[PDB]
């Protein structure tokens with residue numbers, strides 16, 4: 001549950017390698033953000049093409065056709081053609097898959113692979129196969145809620161200064 | 167990976183400064199290396215002279231110089247040309263050779 | 276909705292249109308101001324809250340229709356290059372993971388009855404009995420009971436719809 | 443004259459779909475039943 | 477004597493030189509004898525023993541400086557001049573100078589330039605940094621650029637540098653910093669593919685007296701009008717010089733035919749009797765205009781069967797109907813109504829349309845969402861002129877070259893600009909710092925807010 005998730009996140013932050021040592025000029029950064037308008041801005045053609053990769057073609061077509069239906073209030077009604085409806089029973093699955101694609105965009109395939117571990121022995125929530133792998137990149141922790149992203153970077157002095165100069 | 171645009175009139179001196187701290191000695195060594203590259207009988211003897219100059223250290227930089235000998239020499243000459251007539255003279259001399267023409271085209275675009 | 280009375284003289288129609296425009300402007304502004312009050316925190320009553328909710332619902336639906344028509348006019352905001360970039364990234368990730376696409380559920384799936392039972396239980400859970408359920412809700416309860424009663428026929432219906440239904 | 447706004451949007455949708463299908467043709471392991 | 481042989485020249489790095497801001501000593505704030513260190517890119521006071529530049533040199537071992545006002549290099553602490561031809565690009569970027577042949581060939585440049593970093597671009601098509609709320613000023617300034625006559629006039633400092641100005645005149649900062657910004661934008665050998673309008677906007681806020689700030693975004697049309705009027709006044713030296721470049725380029729002349737309506741709540745007998753009064757008769761109040769104000773028709777307020785898209789639309793010529801000697805607009809001031817006719821008399825070479833979107837109703841400001849359906853490559857304004865003026869006017873076909881568009885709600889709005897790149901014929905959409913390529917056919921689908929057309 002969310003409280004246990006918070007506890008795990010705190011423990012992972014504390015258990016990173018010399019995370020609290022700031023004698024050489026290191027610096028840690030916690031980023032939190034929300035992926036604005038995620039549900040509303042979901043292109044349906046692109047969503048269909050993405051779904052066809054993971055699920056049967058007929059299933060994907062059915063889901064897209066479902067999302068493209070007519071809304072109707074007491075007297076008003078329009079055709080929803082841009083965003084997902086969010087009230088369907090599989091809207092959760094659609095949202096999580098789109099969020100996975102967004103995660104790949106944010107993290108990069110290499111670092112996503114490093115975090116998720118090899119396909120044979122996937123890692124746990126916050127864990128790496130080795131501490132060298134953990135330290136190989138500025139990004140140390142990542143977690144996407146339904147649409148809220150939390151990231152934890154640890155920069156050295158040179159990396160931080162170069163990023164600031166850019 | 168080295169590109170003709172990467173080389174400016176002081177790229178050689180900037181590189182020598184990574185082993186020689188003093189500006190005067192860096193300038194002297196850069197000029198001597200340019201002269202060696204210019205008046206060189208062939209690749210092996212030029213590399214031997216370069217190592218004789220810069221010791222057994224700096225061998226990575228010497229390897230880069232030997233790998234791209236003519237490119238660096240002509241790019242530095244063109245970028246350091248003080249006069250417009252001189253610049254055009256080096257441009258024509260380079261164009262006289264295909265490889266040097268390749269370098270010129272890379273420099274322009 | 277479009278309003279055009281064929282027999283109404285055009286000057287009277289113009290006057291009515293001006294009236295409606297003025298009233299609409301006042302309606303929108305007062306709805307927004309009242310919502311700012313209520314949200315910022317002010318003492319209000321059930322009738323005012325309900326009326327403001329209705330007004331805000333209508334305004335939001337108008338805005339959503341504007342959004343949909345603007346989308347249909349401006350085409351996909353995601354360019355073809357961006358689409359192919361994200362698509363290639365996704366396929367590369369799935370290949371790396373060695374993922375096997377989910378198949379269409381077979382006719383004799385082992386757990387299909389389990390999944391149907393879970394779905395029906397989840398649908399039933401949404402009824403915290405108040406003793407007053409409307410026609411549609413009671414009809415859905417009846418359908419859920421029918422599916423509970425005869426699982427296999429409901430599965431046949433479901434697979435038929437998943438294969439053919441598109442409207 | 444007038445503009446048929448829907449037509450240009452439909453053309454752009456079809457162009458995007460055509461390009462995505464071009465890309466998808468290369469991908470192999472996809473599944474589909476008759 | 478040691479000049480041409482400075483051993484520290486390799487120390488320079490052009491990745492830190494940013495000459496886009498105020499030129500004052502970073503320690504004493506003085507404008508006098510400013511030298512920029514070419515190893516770190518900071519400004520100090522100039523030269524001599526015990527000076528800030530000298531002490532910085534001996535402190536940090538940064539031994540190369542440039543006199544920001546003289547364009548001469550020096551090597552400190554032993555101050556001797558440096559002469560080297562490879563340093564000319566730094567001076568050029570610091571103070572671009574365009575020769576007459578260059579300004580003549582400025583538009584015929586079909587080959588992209590490349591900045592110091594690996595970024596290709598085209599002169600003029602260059603982004604402007606976005607301070608908090610600046611997009612309106614960015615768009616307006618971008619539109620003002622790309623006007624060959626005005627741009628060419630401002631690309632030579634000698635043109636406007638000698639004109640007189642009263643003692644306590646701050647309104648010349650606008651003209652001189654605008655010249656600086658124009659030269660920076662059209663610099664063909666920049667160190668970066670973007671420019672900072674910080675100084676120009678500081679001058680703008682100062683001269684406007686906190687109107688048109690940079691932390692709050694104002695109306696594009698109001699900013700354009702104020703800027704043009706200010707430029708005209710500032711270029712009018714110690715008087716209202718009747719013909720500046722702004723007047724030569726943009727200002728045309730119209731003939732307004734105002735007829736005071738007798739009264740709405742009067743009997744017909746009195747109403748028609750008042751006609752002979754001459755007070756309610758057509759007058760001729762011919763005046764001048766920097767920009768035409770086109771008024772969109774009111775939104776339909778109800779959707780219809782045709783063009784099922786809820787978005788309305790109008791032809792360009794329907795809104796250009798006004799400004800012909802037939803139509804009559806209805807002005808309504810307190811206690812008085814006027815029927816105003818219009819008749820264009822003098823057409824300027826570069827014509828500005830300012831389509832009125834935002835209107836204040838009884839309660840709030842509403843943005844008209846109507847889209848003007850217009851051609852881009854050809855429009856004939858011959859008919860909207862009197863036959864007495866058509867003989868004088870030879871060429872009257874105009875082409876759109878700039879189009880400023882507003883997006884979003886009136887409060888949380890944003891501005892973008894479609895610009896035609898001469899030399900080529902490609903249309904680029906500049907948002908504050910992003911440069912997209914827009915197809916010619918998609919310009920007409922936007923809510924054109926301001927437009928600039930060229931007479932050919």
Ligand SMILES: [Zn+2]
Nearest residue numbers: 513516536538
């Ligand atoms: Zn310094």
